[PDB]
Amino acid sequence: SKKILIVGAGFSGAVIGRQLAEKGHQVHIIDQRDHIGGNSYDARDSETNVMVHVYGPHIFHTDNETVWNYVNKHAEMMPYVNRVKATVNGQVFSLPINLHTINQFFSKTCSPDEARALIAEKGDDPQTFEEEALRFIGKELYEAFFKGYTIKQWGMQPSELPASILKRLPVRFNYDDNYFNHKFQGMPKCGYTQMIKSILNHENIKVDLQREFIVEERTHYDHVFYSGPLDAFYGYQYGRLGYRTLDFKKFTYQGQYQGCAVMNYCSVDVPYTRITEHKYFSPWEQHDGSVCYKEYSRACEENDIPYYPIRQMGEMALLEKYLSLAENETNITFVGRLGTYRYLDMDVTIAEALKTAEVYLNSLTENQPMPVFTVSV
Template sequence: MQKNILIVGAGFSGVVIARKLAECGHKIRIIDRRSHIAGNCYDARDQETNVMVHTYGPHIFHTDNKEVWDFVNQYSVMMPYINRVKATYKNRVFSLPINLHTINQFFNKTCSPDEAKALIASKGDSTIETPLTFEQQALKFVGKELYEAFFKGYTLKQWGMQPSELPASILKRLPVRFNYDDNYFNHKYQGMPQQGYTSMIENMVEHPNIQVELNVDFSDDDRGGYDHIFYSGPLDAFYHNKFGRLGYRTLDFDRFKYDGDYQGCAVMNYCDQDVPYTRITEHKYFSPWESHEKSVCYKEFSRNCEEGDIPYYPIRQMGEMTLLHKYLDLAEKEESITFIGRLGTYRYLDMDVTIAEALNTAKIYLQSLSNQDNKMPVFTVNVR
């Protein structure tokens, strides 16, 4: 039985679900309030330099999930790309994540891997048994000097909060390596779409059963007339912020051009607290298979998200969780709607996780159609 489905949001979450359901014969209408598809992954060529610019900040594809990797390769040629991040601290440049070269350079040593492990162990605060905060996690495992150099100031700027107020789980994502590997990610599959993310998503929605409408906002009137809705907008906005706004961090960009190479790498973090921006990205380095004489760069500034801003990073902390549970209690009573993606589930998600969850959501929906005992859930992941 063909179903009429509304998908709110033309980012990865909505488009992946749309494609999988369209291939099974269902009619899909995608709406997006913006003037373009691809959400925050939207990219476009700068007319003057021809550099592919990641309009809402850089997105680098990395995953260990072969299903996800095979899926995106159906819609784009994925070019090899290794993310090698640099960091400026007190007028010196280091490699991130912290690796053997970073350690030797920072402490002016020539340590072997075993010597470096012993050195870092000696720097760590052994009095902290179970780290509860970001600061405690860093102090226990890398010590005060590396913490203050690479984490304290950057984290304060990125999150607008003292590291002592943030959960330890945030730092568990950041590795320390005792070799000279400066690949920022550990994943098996890493790359960039040759023609950009916008092109990739355009290819995904190229299907006779998919209709895309831009500059269209979701309204309560849209809740009728569809067999199911997949909603990737902000969860609190769906309920008109009746309990208040969930907390997000947003980004401001100072975009500038440079005749030549500005910094010699794609990403340069600025860890000093007195530097107002968190990093500078040079976008031609995200397409190393291309050659460009001129450059397009972004300075990134992080701040609290206000009304009308684009929400980037959900702030899942103690105060936010109380408010979030009020919205989840409402949402879980809904019928014929599933909340998806970073905004719909109020979770930070990398692209590969977003796609994996979307593929799984489509599978669950198709299973619910074939078996009436399997009711389509409002959330297909644990959001509490």
């Protein structure tokens, strides 16, 4: 029976914790926040009865059946297919770019094959160096849907990012407006917080909230699983890792503010990146009042929640410093979106957390040392 400290009550910590707890280990899970869930956390607005996704829209989607089966054990999963609109050029469009977006954009009536001909004769360019340089789609579409969105979202010009990150033509030549191509797509009936609470619901798990990790503690345990920022663990001794932060400005509207869950504003002339109307993530509930967030993207200064990691040369170079400090550590595994500096989806989080616990469990049945990283960086 091993004594485990987990730093974080998000999917990583909850899922590693419950796998271990079930093989009889004594798991202690701590979180600096006053609530479990991590960034997947949702709460019901008190004035409105609206399930608010507190750290932004969280839509569940996976091609992994084992991950799907696992979340259904812990929540009632509701069919929910996310559909995004975008406002730009004084018009409202379906996202991703599809047959309707094209026909509406160019005031046309193209069939799919006619639209393929349009996009080819609208594309521009020998050997492409920039993301700006992807005239897959041409100038009007790059500018409408891609340029101002990158500037607001990444605080960068698309001529500044590499040609990668846009591997394929970003258009779908039919009227399917599902945003996500994943096989399994749903929404927990009662939210992610109730889901993760269920996950944490084992006698071998003790949860302590409003509690920050303190390094000296590490010596009271057989192993630590750490889902906190990898640079923060080292006190940012080499400097902070590049992140974008988000500000959410909350407002309550009486009625329906926008008529969909998520509306993107592609233009630089709109300072928020998108508006989320949370009641739309629970279509099986009726709400008179509505909680909405205007979302603002910005450089992660000090005291900000890290959201989206910027991952270019400068950052990876700085990461490499922490990476070789860390690969020298003896009884710790860094896991999750922050412990590893990657953007991970919820389903990919749980996947990696089931595998992490499985690796650790194996390491005991055997002879063998538990690695500091369970996935490559």
